[PDB]
Amino acid sequence: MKVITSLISSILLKFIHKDFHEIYARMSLLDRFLLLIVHGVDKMVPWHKLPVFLGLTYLEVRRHLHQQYNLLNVGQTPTGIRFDPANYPYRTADGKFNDPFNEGVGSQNSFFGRNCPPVDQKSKLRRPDPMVVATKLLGRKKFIDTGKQFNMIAASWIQFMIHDWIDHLEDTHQIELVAPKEVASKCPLSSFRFLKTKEVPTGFFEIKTGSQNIRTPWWDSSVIYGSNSKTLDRVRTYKDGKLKISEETGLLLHDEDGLAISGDIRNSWAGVSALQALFIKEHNAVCDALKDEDDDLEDEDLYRYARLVTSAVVAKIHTIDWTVQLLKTDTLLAGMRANWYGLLGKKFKDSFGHAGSSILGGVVGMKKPQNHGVPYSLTEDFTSVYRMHSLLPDQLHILDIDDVPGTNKSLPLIQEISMRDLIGRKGEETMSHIGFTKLMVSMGHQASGALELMNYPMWLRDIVPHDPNGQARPDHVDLAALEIYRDRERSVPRYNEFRRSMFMIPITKWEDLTEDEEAIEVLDDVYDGDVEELDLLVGLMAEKKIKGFAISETAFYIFLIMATRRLEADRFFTSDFNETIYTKKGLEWVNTTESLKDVIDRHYPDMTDKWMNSESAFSVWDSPPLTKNPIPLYLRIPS
Numbered sequence: 001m002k003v004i005t006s007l008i009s010s011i012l013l014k015f016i017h018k019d020f021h022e023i024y025a026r027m028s029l030l031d032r033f034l035l036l037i038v039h040g041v042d043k044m045v046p047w048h049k050l051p052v053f054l055g056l057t058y059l060e061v062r063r064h065l066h067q068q069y070n071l072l073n074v075g076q077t078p079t080g081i082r083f084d085p086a087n088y089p090y091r092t093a094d095g096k097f098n099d100p101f102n103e104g105v106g107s108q109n110s111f112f113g114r115n116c117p118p119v120d121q122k123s124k125l126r127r128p129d130p131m132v133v134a135t136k137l138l139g140r141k142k143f144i145d146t147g148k149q150f151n152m153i154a155a156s157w158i159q160f161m162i163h164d165w166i167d168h169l170e171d172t173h174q175i176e177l178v179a180p181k182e183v184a185s186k187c188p189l190s191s192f193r194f195l196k197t198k199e200v201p202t203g204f205f206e207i208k209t210g211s212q213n214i215r216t217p218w219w220d221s222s223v224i225y226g227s228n229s230k231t232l233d234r235v236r237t238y239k240d241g242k243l244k245i246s247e248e249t250g251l252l253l254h255d256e257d258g259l260a261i262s263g264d265i266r267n268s269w270a271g272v273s274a275l276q277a278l279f280i281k282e283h284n285a286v287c288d289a290l291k292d293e294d295d296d297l298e299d300e301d302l303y304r305y306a307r308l309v310t311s312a313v314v315a316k317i318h319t320i321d322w323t324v325q326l327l328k329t330d331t332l333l334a335g336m337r338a339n340w341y342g343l344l345g346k347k348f349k350d351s352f353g354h355a356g357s358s359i360l361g362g363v364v365g366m367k368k369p370q371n372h373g374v375p376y377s378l379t380e381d382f383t384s385v386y387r388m389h390s391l392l393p394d395q396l397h398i399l400d401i402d403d404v405p406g407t408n409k410s411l412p413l414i415q416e417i418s419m420r421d422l423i424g425r426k427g428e429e430t431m432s433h434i435g436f437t438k439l440m441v442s443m444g445h446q447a448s449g450a451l452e453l454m455n456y457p458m459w460l461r462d463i464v465p466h467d468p469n470g471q472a473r474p475d476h477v478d479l480a481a482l483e484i485y486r487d488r489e490r491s492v493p494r495y496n497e498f499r500r501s502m503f504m505i506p507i508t509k510w511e512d513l514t515e516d517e518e519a520i521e522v523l524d525d526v527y528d529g530d531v532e533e534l535d536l537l538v539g540l541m542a543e544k545k546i547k548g549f550a551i552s553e554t555a556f557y558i559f560l561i562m563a564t565r566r567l568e569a570d571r572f573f574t575s576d577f578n579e580t581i582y583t584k585k586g587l588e589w590v591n592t593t594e595s596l597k598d599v600i601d602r603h604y605p606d607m608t609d610k611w612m613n614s615e616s617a618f619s620v621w622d623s624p625p626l627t628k629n630p631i632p633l634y635l636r637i638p639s
């Protein structure tokens with residue numbers, strides 16, 4: 001029967017796109033049927049046009065297929081000797097001892113995994129020229145924003161997450177890119193130097209080398225706690241479990257060089273510093289709540305509990321508040337909330353407990369972590385799809401918070417500040433003058449840039465990059481050109497091959513990608529008509545967006561699997577998401593915090609009442625009021 005059904009699965013191969021016939025051979029019988037269904041929907045009414053309940057059904061199936069076929073291990077698993085996870089009921093300084101079966105999984109300096117098989121591009125690192133790509137396709141011509149959907153707090157937030165998640169170890173070898181004559185007059189830098197990505201031998205045939213992640217890939221708030229014991233030590237006060245902050249201003253402290261003191265400040269700016277400070281306040285407020293409950297808790301005990309609570313609050317806010325604004329559709333409102341609370345919902349879970357399955361109860365609080373047989377990591381492909389620098393504006397619009405708010409709590413502009421004055425060391429100085437409140441309100445009221453072509457801040461095409469400790473390097477970089485180089489250097493498939501690897505129908509011509517006729521002509525020029533040479537970053541920016549999505553669908557499918565993975569693979573969101581590990585009050589703190597607004601309201605009790613008219617703190621704050629849709633969420637049809 002299995003052999004006969006296999007023969008029928010080879011018969012139905014006549015309905016699958018030819019480019020998937022290879023991944024199809026890897027697949028189980030049921031999964032072959034599931035691919036037939038997913039692919040069928042892709043060819044008919046796309047998932048994002050279905051009624052929410054069917055959209056979610058599609059995403060559940062597609063996500064399952066990515067979990068089975070788009071998780072590739074890189075390097076030997078850092079198993080180590082056997083350990084008891086009960087001996088590590090807290091987030092370790094370097095992320096070790098989380099995976100109960102592999103001590104090194106998710107730790108600092110672990111290998112980046114992959115979602116798509118690598119494509120060696122060493123012979124075409126400069127084809128087409130990355131500075132030509134940057135100049136013609138990326139550099140911002142006219143600023144394009146995201147309307148009211150996704151403000152500068154939301155742009156700060158995603159960078160704040162990147163600083164927790166991913167950074168590539170560099171080698172000592174220097175590379176130099178030179179601007180060709182054709183574009184040199186339009187390049188801020190005529191040439192620039194940077195460090196090669198460290199390419200470490202794995203010892204395997206399939207994937208022979210890998211990159212190492214110098215941030216813990218666990219979602220452990222290493223952005224404020226550091227990624228090892230040495231960097232943790234720098235942020236600890238050693239009093240009452242707390243972290244360093246200015247009590248007077250609510251801003252970060254600075255060292256003798258004027259560099260901010262937090263977990264990871266590499267290539268940072270004022271918006272990130274604001275979020276670091278806010279979450280240090282959160283951590284410290286958890287310490288206060290726990291020290292009161294129990295006066296027998298020492299500094300180390302308080303720190304450990306407060307870190308569990310704070311990192312869980314951040315993950316929750318990201319999942320059910322931030323992502324819901326990035327992906328502003330009914331289907332993703334339902335889907336992201338279901339990741340946390342399950343299809344059955346918050347009220348049910350809060351009343352009756354976890355239903356037992358991830359679908360019904362959420363991945364959060366599941367009985368065991370799940371890695372789908374592949375050790376947890378954040379991947380090369382994940383890095384590429386989160387390259388979202390076009391979110392940044394040219395200037396920050398500082399508002400007059402002394403003025404009486406107008407209709408929808410609007411405020412007038414008082415000054416425009418170049419983003420150059422808000423980044424790195426200079427940004428800390430500028431922020432000291434502006435202050436937390438003025439910066440936060442101004443960011444709330446300002447739209448981000450959109451992820452479209454020709455919208456990459458020109459100021460990023462000549463920036464001073466940092467060593468991992470935030471110290472300035474003498475060699476400036478053109479970040480737009482550099483990102484193109486990195487994706488190639490790290491063997492991430494270019495746009496069309498990436499799509500095929502993720503069982504998405506590849507494009508055959510530029511018109512499949514975008515309706516913008518002038519952009520099509522630039523694409524055709526840069527790539528000499530060849531859709532197979534189209535860079536991943538370029539394609540991700542160019543791709544026509546689903547209504548309400550700030551990102552491409554191609555990026556979204558990586559988000560779909562990896563966001564779920566960050567929660568489900570981690571003991572502290574699953575087997576150890578309970579009152580014993582978090583304390584009763586600690587777990588309550590997580591379970592009653594639903595949004596960034598809740599956190600802002602905790603530390604700045606009047607800010608959102610005075611100045612925020614939107615429901616989410618990640619939406620532009622002077623948005624008009626919205627009347628709720630009376631149609632039940634799971635039944636809504638997109639228009």
Ligand code: HEM
Pocket residue numbers: 155156158159162166167168194267268269383384386387388389391392423463465466477479482486
């Ligand atoms: C003022 C703000 C920012 C500055 C100065 C900055 C600068 C940089 C620099 C210099 C690099 C390393 C380039 C290299 O050597 O490979 C980098 C990497 C990166 N940035 Fe930004 N960036 C900023 C904001 C953002 C934002 C808003 C995002 C949105 C998600 C973002 C996402 C990333 C990602 C995913 C990487 C790759 C990390 C890796 O290779 O592991 N950055 N950035």
Ligand SMILES: CCCCCCCCCO[C@@H]1O[C@H](CO)[C@@H](O)[C@H](O)[C@H]1O
Pocket residue numbers: 037038041045049050051054055057058061
């Ligand atoms: C795992 C796949 C998840 C569900 C896929 C179901 C798609 C079929 C839906 O067709 C039904 O009839 C219509 C014709 O008018 C469709 O357009 C409409 O949306 C839908 O109500």
Ligand SMILES: [Ca+2]
Pocket residue numbers: 164165215216217218219220221222223
């Ligand atoms: Ca981390």
Ligand SMILES: [Ca+2]
Pocket residue numbers: 233234
């Ligand atoms: Ca000290």
Ligand SMILES: [Ca+2]
Pocket residue numbers: 293294295296297
């Ligand atoms: Ca006690």
Ligand SMILES: [Ca+2]
Pocket residue numbers: 410411445622
């Ligand atoms: Ca306004």
Ligand SMILES: [Ca+2]
Pocket residue numbers: 518521522
């Ligand atoms: Ca033209």
Ligand SMILES: [Cl-]
Pocket residue numbers: 228230231
């Ligand atoms: Cl270090």
Ligand SMILES: [Cl-]
Pocket residue numbers: 323559563
């Ligand atoms: Cl995400």
Ligand SMILES: [Cl-]
Pocket residue numbers: 590591592
């Ligand atoms: Cl919760």
